[PDB]
Protein backbone atom coordinates (compact mmCIF):
# COMPACT_ATOMS: atom_id res chain seq x y z
CA UNK A 1 0.00 0.00 0.00
CA UNK A 2 1.43 3.35 -1.11
CA UNK A 3 1.02 6.08 1.51
CA UNK A 4 1.90 9.75 1.87
CA UNK A 5 5.09 8.92 3.79
CA UNK A 6 8.15 8.13 1.64
CA UNK A 7 9.18 4.49 1.35
CA UNK A 8 12.29 3.26 3.13
CA UNK A 9 14.52 0.60 1.57
CA UNK A 10 16.93 -1.98 2.92
CA UNK A 11 20.70 -2.00 2.52
CA UNK A 12 21.74 -2.65 -1.06
CA UNK A 13 25.21 -3.85 -0.09
CA UNK A 14 28.18 -2.48 -2.01
CA UNK A 15 30.00 -5.16 -3.99
CA UNK A 16 33.75 -5.59 -3.58
CA UNK A 17 35.82 -7.43 -6.21
CA UNK A 18 38.83 -9.52 -5.08
CA UNK A 19 39.47 -8.00 -1.66
CA UNK A 20 41.67 -10.93 -0.56
CA UNK A 21 44.64 -9.45 -2.45
CA UNK A 22 44.30 -6.45 -0.12
CA UNK A 23 44.87 -8.70 2.90
CA UNK A 24 48.42 -9.73 1.99
CA UNK A 25 50.98 -7.70 0.05
CA UNK A 26 53.60 -9.34 -2.17
CA UNK A 27 57.06 -7.97 -2.97
CA UNK A 28 59.54 -8.92 -5.71
CA UNK A 29 61.39 -11.29 -3.34
CA UNK A 30 60.34 -14.56 -1.75
CA UNK A 31 58.48 -13.56 1.41
CA UNK A 32 54.90 -13.36 2.67
CA UNK A 33 53.69 -10.39 4.72
CA UNK A 34 50.76 -9.43 6.93
CA UNK A 35 49.38 -5.97 6.16
CA UNK A 36 46.80 -5.92 8.98
CA UNK A 37 46.80 -7.16 12.55
CA UNK A 38 45.71 -10.67 13.55
CA UNK A 39 43.20 -11.21 16.36
CA UNK A 40 44.83 -13.06 19.30
CA UNK A 41 41.63 -14.74 20.53
CA UNK A 42 41.39 -18.52 20.81
CA UNK A 43 38.28 -19.43 18.79
CA UNK A 44 38.67 -16.16 16.85
CA UNK A 45 42.03 -17.49 15.76
CA UNK A 46 44.48 -17.49 12.85
CA UNK A 47 42.02 -17.66 9.95
CA UNK A 48 39.99 -14.47 10.05
CA UNK A 49 41.07 -10.89 9.38
CA UNK A 50 40.35 -7.62 11.15
CA UNK A 51 39.37 -4.13 9.98
CA UNK A 52 41.30 -0.90 9.43
CA UNK A 53 39.04 2.03 10.28
CA UNK A 54 39.81 5.72 10.76
CA UNK A 55 39.65 5.52 14.57
CA UNK A 56 39.33 1.91 15.75
CA UNK A 57 40.14 -1.76 15.17
CA UNK A 58 37.31 -4.30 15.01
CA UNK A 59 37.09 -7.97 14.05
CA UNK A 60 34.34 -9.99 12.37
CA UNK A 61 32.67 -12.59 14.60
CA UNK A 62 34.41 -12.36 17.99
CA UNK A 63 33.76 -8.60 18.42
CA UNK A 64 36.92 -7.31 20.11
CA UNK A 65 37.17 -3.53 19.64
CA UNK A 66 40.52 -1.75 19.97
CA UNK A 67 41.27 1.97 19.63
CA UNK A 68 44.16 4.32 20.36
Amino acid sequence: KSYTTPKKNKHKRKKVKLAVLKYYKVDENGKISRLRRECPSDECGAGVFMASHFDRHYCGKCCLTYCF
Binding site: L18, V20, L21, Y24, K31, I32, G47, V48
Partner: protein, 117 residues
Protein backbone atom coordinates in the same frame (compact mmCIF):
# COMPACT_ATOMS: atom_id res chain seq x y z
CA UNK B 1 47.22 -38.24 -12.50
CA UNK B 2 43.98 -36.42 -13.38
CA UNK B 3 41.69 -39.40 -12.81
CA UNK B 4 43.39 -39.89 -9.43
CA UNK B 5 42.69 -36.21 -8.73
CA UNK B 6 39.00 -36.54 -9.61
CA UNK B 7 38.66 -39.76 -7.58
CA UNK B 8 40.21 -38.22 -4.46
CA UNK B 9 38.05 -35.10 -5.00
CA UNK B 10 34.93 -37.29 -5.20
CA UNK B 11 36.02 -39.18 -2.06
CA UNK B 12 36.49 -35.87 -0.24
CA UNK B 13 33.07 -34.73 -1.53
CA UNK B 14 31.41 -37.86 -0.12
CA UNK B 15 33.28 -37.85 3.23
CA UNK B 16 33.13 -34.01 3.63
CA UNK B 17 36.77 -33.21 2.95
CA UNK B 18 36.57 -30.17 0.67
CA UNK B 19 37.52 -26.52 1.17
CA UNK B 20 36.40 -24.67 -1.95
CA UNK B 21 36.94 -21.00 -2.75
CA UNK B 22 40.03 -18.89 -2.17
CA UNK B 23 39.58 -17.30 1.26
CA UNK B 24 38.48 -20.63 2.74
CA UNK B 25 41.61 -22.10 1.12
CA UNK B 26 43.70 -19.36 2.77
CA UNK B 27 42.05 -20.00 6.15
CA UNK B 28 42.70 -23.75 5.81
CA UNK B 29 46.31 -23.03 4.82
CA UNK B 30 46.91 -20.68 7.77
CA UNK B 31 45.17 -23.18 10.08
CA UNK B 32 48.04 -25.49 9.00
CA UNK B 33 46.14 -28.69 8.26
CA UNK B 34 45.93 -28.19 4.48
CA UNK B 35 47.61 -30.93 2.46
CA UNK B 36 47.06 -30.43 -1.29
CA UNK B 37 46.00 -27.34 -3.25
CA UNK B 38 45.16 -27.06 -6.96
CA UNK B 39 45.71 -23.90 -9.01
CA UNK B 40 44.09 -23.44 -12.42
CA UNK B 41 46.31 -22.07 -15.19
CA UNK B 42 45.42 -19.88 -18.25
CA UNK B 43 43.23 -17.64 -16.09
CA UNK B 44 42.84 -13.88 -15.56
CA UNK B 45 45.56 -13.54 -12.92
CA UNK B 46 47.66 -10.33 -13.09
CA UNK B 47 48.52 -10.71 -9.40
CA UNK B 48 46.71 -13.88 -8.29
CA UNK B 49 49.22 -16.46 -9.57
CA UNK B 50 52.17 -15.10 -7.61
CA UNK B 51 49.82 -14.32 -4.71
CA UNK B 52 48.84 -18.00 -4.45
CA UNK B 53 52.51 -18.88 -5.08
CA UNK B 54 53.41 -16.76 -2.04
CA UNK B 55 50.78 -18.57 0.04
CA UNK B 56 51.71 -22.04 -1.24
CA UNK B 57 55.52 -21.71 -1.39
CA UNK B 58 56.29 -21.90 2.35
CA UNK B 59 56.63 -25.65 3.16
CA UNK B 60 55.06 -29.09 2.44
CA UNK B 61 52.58 -27.68 -0.12
CA UNK B 62 52.43 -29.24 -3.58
CA UNK B 63 50.68 -28.03 -6.73
CA UNK B 64 48.49 -29.45 -9.50
CA UNK B 65 48.12 -27.78 -12.92
CA UNK B 66 44.62 -27.95 -14.42
CA UNK B 67 43.87 -26.07 -17.63
CA UNK B 68 40.11 -25.46 -17.80
CA UNK B 69 38.17 -23.94 -14.92
CA UNK B 70 34.80 -25.38 -15.97
CA UNK B 71 36.13 -28.95 -16.14
CA UNK B 72 37.61 -28.89 -12.62
CA UNK B 73 34.28 -27.66 -11.24
CA UNK B 74 32.76 -31.03 -12.15
CA UNK B 75 35.12 -32.98 -9.89
CA UNK B 76 34.72 -30.72 -6.84
CA UNK B 77 30.92 -30.83 -7.15
CA UNK B 78 30.61 -27.04 -7.22
CA UNK B 79 27.36 -27.21 -9.21
CA UNK B 80 25.13 -30.05 -10.40
CA UNK B 81 22.07 -29.01 -12.41
CA UNK B 82 20.09 -31.47 -14.60
CA UNK B 83 22.31 -34.49 -13.97
CA UNK B 84 20.56 -36.58 -16.66
CA UNK B 85 23.41 -36.38 -19.16
CA UNK B 86 25.42 -33.17 -19.51
CA UNK B 87 25.09 -30.35 -16.95
CA UNK B 88 23.14 -27.27 -17.97
CA UNK B 89 25.55 -24.77 -16.40
CA UNK B 90 28.36 -25.33 -13.88
CA UNK B 91 30.41 -22.32 -12.82
CA UNK B 92 34.16 -22.80 -12.51
CA UNK B 93 36.29 -22.38 -9.40
CA UNK B 94 39.93 -21.45 -8.82
CA UNK B 95 41.37 -23.40 -5.86
CA UNK B 96 40.45 -26.47 -3.80
CA UNK B 97 41.90 -27.69 -0.48
CA UNK B 98 41.36 -31.38 0.31
CA UNK B 99 41.00 -33.09 3.69
CA UNK B 100 41.99 -36.71 3.09
CA UNK B 101 40.20 -38.77 5.75
CA UNK B 102 39.27 -41.93 3.83
CA UNK B 103 42.95 -42.58 3.16
CA UNK B 104 42.57 -45.93 1.36
CA UNK B 105 42.75 -45.66 -2.44
CA UNK B 106 45.30 -46.59 -5.10
CA UNK B 107 44.58 -43.20 -6.68
CA UNK B 108 45.91 -41.52 -3.53
CA UNK B 109 49.14 -43.54 -3.59
CA UNK B 110 49.72 -42.94 -7.31
CA UNK B 111 49.16 -39.20 -6.86
CA UNK B 112 51.45 -39.25 -3.79
CA UNK B 113 54.22 -41.03 -5.69
CA UNK B 114 53.79 -38.36 -8.34
CA UNK B 115 54.06 -35.78 -5.51
CA UNK B 116 57.28 -37.10 -3.95
CA UNK B 117 59.14 -37.39 -7.27
Amino acid sequence: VNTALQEVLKTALIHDGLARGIREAAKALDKRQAHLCVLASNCDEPMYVKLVEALCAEHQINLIKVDDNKKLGEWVGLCKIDREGKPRKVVGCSCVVVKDYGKESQAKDVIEEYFKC
